[PDB]
């Protein structure tokens, strides 16, 4: 564990691949490998450089589209949503440091073991020192994900994420189905709708309808803070998804969310009771 560290408290896997591919130092190995094993809900954050950062002028990434694709079986590029359905990837870039961040959130449930890599090629970059023209190298990250233990106690209306959520139904032309779930403390829940549907309130779980306060548009932070959540607006498959879990929250909570279209509408209803226990 030289560049990739996994903190258990935050369940965060931070990998730094900058000085390892720096083209200013003589290097004995052209391919530097680092392996990481991840489980449900783990978060992988890789901090890589850009073309603007010095010594990484001709830097590039493989697959060139990180947010969408990965190197499946360390071989052929494949959309990450295909092998890890319900995952969430984000790309950040700090112009002050010329450094980007690839952030991967593993879904709360992984139905099948998955192995895939990500390459960071800096071989094309170079520097000139003394009578030498030093070059960069490439670094490969091999990520393995275990089986995900338990199906999320959430709702799925796309019908595609049946293995991920407890409730799944194939979308119908005209339907007003409403999914009700009872969740406890430190239990996962979520929803899955089609991307072109309207989310109500927008970016749900972060701003849920305050059913106690008569279905009020308010940030969930006001209702509670001992919660963890995530959400993707549209994946490669064209579906919006969100997840939530309460952590040492003593207050009983009831909130809701809605995906609506001109043809049908679907509603998620969740009841957080810390004393509630699954049958």
């Amino acid at each position, epitope marked *: 564990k030289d560049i990739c560290k996994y903190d258990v408290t935050t369940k965060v896997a931070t990998c730094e691949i900058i000085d390892t591919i720096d083209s200013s130092v003589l290097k004995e190995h052209h391919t530097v490998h680092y392996s990481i094993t991840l489980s449900r809900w783990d978060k992988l954050i890789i901090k890589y450089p850009t073309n603007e950062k010095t010594h990484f002028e001709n830097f590039f990434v493989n697959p060139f589209n990180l947010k969408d694709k990965v190197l499946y079986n360390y071989n052929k590029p494949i959309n990450i949503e295909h092998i890890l359905p319900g995952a969430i990837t984000t790309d950040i870039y700090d112009t002050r440091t010329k450094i980007k961040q690839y952030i991967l959130r593993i879904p709360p449930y992984v139905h099948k073991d998955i192995h895939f890599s990500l390459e960071f090629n800096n071989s094309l970059s170079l520097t000139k020192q003394n*009578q*030498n023209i030093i070059y*960069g190298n490439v670094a490969k990250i091999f990520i393995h994900i275990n089986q995900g233990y338990k199906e999320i106690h959430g709702c799925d209306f796309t019908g595609k994420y049946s293995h991920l959520f407890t409730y799944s139904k194939k979308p119908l032309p005209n339907d007003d189905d409403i999914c009700n779930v009872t969740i406890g403390n430190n239990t996962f829940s979520g929803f899955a709708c089609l991307s072109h549907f309207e989310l109500k309130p927008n970016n749900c779980f972060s701003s849920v309808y305050d059913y106690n306060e008569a279905n009020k548009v308010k940030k969930l932070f006001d209702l509670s803070t001992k919660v963890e959540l995530d959400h993707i607006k549209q994946n490669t498959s064209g579906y919006t998804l969100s997840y939530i879990i309460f952590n040492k929250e003593s207050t009983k909570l009831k909130f809701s969310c809605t995906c609506s279209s001109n043809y049908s509408n679907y509603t998620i209803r969740i009841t957080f009771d810390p004393n509630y226990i699954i049958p």
Partner: nanobody
Amino acid sequence: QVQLQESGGGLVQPGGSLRLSCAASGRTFSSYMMAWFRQSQGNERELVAGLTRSGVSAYYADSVKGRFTISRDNAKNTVYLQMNSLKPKDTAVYYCAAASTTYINHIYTNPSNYPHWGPGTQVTV
């Protein structure tokens, strides 16, 4: 340990192409860094193309940049220098130099830093 041999160079009309090949014997090319060197009549030896031991980091001098391309057939143990759009300045005795280093990502600039050299082949345009 490694002996170099150039081949495939002669007279061409301005605007043509050539493929200079350089074969090694004694040890595999992967264990050596490779470079092509220029030398016109009564002038010093300059570097045109270079190649680290990684085989993927190729350097091209600004003179031949955008027209020359280096390659390494490790099966045939040969380095190929493709030279397209040949211009009157390219007229020189092209040499093939190889050095031995335990680093895979660097290439030397001065011809003195290269212990092993090969008998150059003349390329006139």
